[PDB]
């Protein structure tokens, strides 16, 4: 009771460092609720021995953050996504937050070019294609052909 | 093709109706 009420008090706490720029941040701590309940199933603490108000908040956080394997196979169908879009379009004035309104530590003088032969291993295909007329006086430096430099 | 957003979550139902919240408030009052 005390731990889940501390979780619900921290999750409903508004923050002021992002100044609510996108959404409420602390709601993700309700994601801790499906973990700790499972710990209760290991601790022998019955979840039916919780008060009705805390059980309402726990079922709120459970339907916000919990899914099963059988729902996870069907929750991304386009029918349900487009029903979500249509339900936001028709009555979104009822459910919307805005519509209410070497080793470096022993390195000091680094040894460069230590005769490691790059010709024993094979990297021969290093071909590159440069645009025609880099130093040509008749071909202009600025042009739409500069867009040919970014194409792979 | 137009790209789909990979940082947009999948649309899923997480919430209750106005009637269910009203019935919860009514039962808790009782």
């Amino acid at each position: 009771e005390l731990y889940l009420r501390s979780i619900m008090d921290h999750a409903n706490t508004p923050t002021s460092e992002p100044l609510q720029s996108f959404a409420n941040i602390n709601v993700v701590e309700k994601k801790k609720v499906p973990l700790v309940l499972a710990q209760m199933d290991e601790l022998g603490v019955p979840r039916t021995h919780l008060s009705r108000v805390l059980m309402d908040e726990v079922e709120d956080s459970l339907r916000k953050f919990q899914t099963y394997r059988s729902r996870f196979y069907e929750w991304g169908r386009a029918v349900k996504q487009f029903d979500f879009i249509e339900f936001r379009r028709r009555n979104g004035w009822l459910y919307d937050l805005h519509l209410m309104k070497g080793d470096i530590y022993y390195d000091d003088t680094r040894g460069l070019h230590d005769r490691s032969p790059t010709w024993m291993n094979e990297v021969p295909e290093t071909r590159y294609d440069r645009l025609y007329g880099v130093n040509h006086p008749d071909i202009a430096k600025i042009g739409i052909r500069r867009h040919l430099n970014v194409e792979y | 093709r137009k790209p789909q957003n990979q940082w947009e979550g999948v649309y899923y139902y997480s919430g209750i109706t106005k009637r269910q919240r009203h019935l919860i408030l009514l039962h808790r009052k009782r």
Binding site: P18, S21, F22, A23, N24, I25, V27, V28, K31, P34, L35, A38, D41, E42, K64, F65, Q66, T67, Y68, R69, F72 | W7, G9, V10, Y12, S14
Partner: protein, 98 residues
């Protein structure tokens, strides 16, 4: 700055991307009883432990198939199917060495 792109996604954006998607309840994988040695592979047919891959993993399905084949098929139909040498016996020279 004029063109600053961060190479680390900020903590607020990670928190928003975490707070929008739910959890899978079977990721907790807690276990305290043990394994059901008799029932868990013999549960109801819609949610059953379906075998995969080779035919050696299909023990019950081969048994049910053989039982169904013996159930539906009469023997008076299965008498008529003959092998190759039973047909070749009517040839005037059926047998010779290769």
């Amino acid at each position: 700055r004029m063109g600053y792109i961060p190479r680390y996604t900020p903590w607020e954006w990670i928190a928003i991307q975490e707070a929008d998607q739910p959890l899978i309840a079977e990721q907790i994988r807690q276990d305290n009883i043990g394994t059901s040695y008799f029932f868990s592979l013999n549960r109801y047919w819609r949610y059953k432990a379906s075998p995969h891959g080779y035919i050696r993993h299909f023990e019950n399905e081969v048994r049910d198939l053989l039982q169904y084949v013996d159930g539906v098929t009469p023997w008076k139909q299965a008498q008529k199917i003959r092998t190759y040498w039973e047909v070749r016996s009517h040839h005037p020279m059926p047998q010779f060495n290769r």
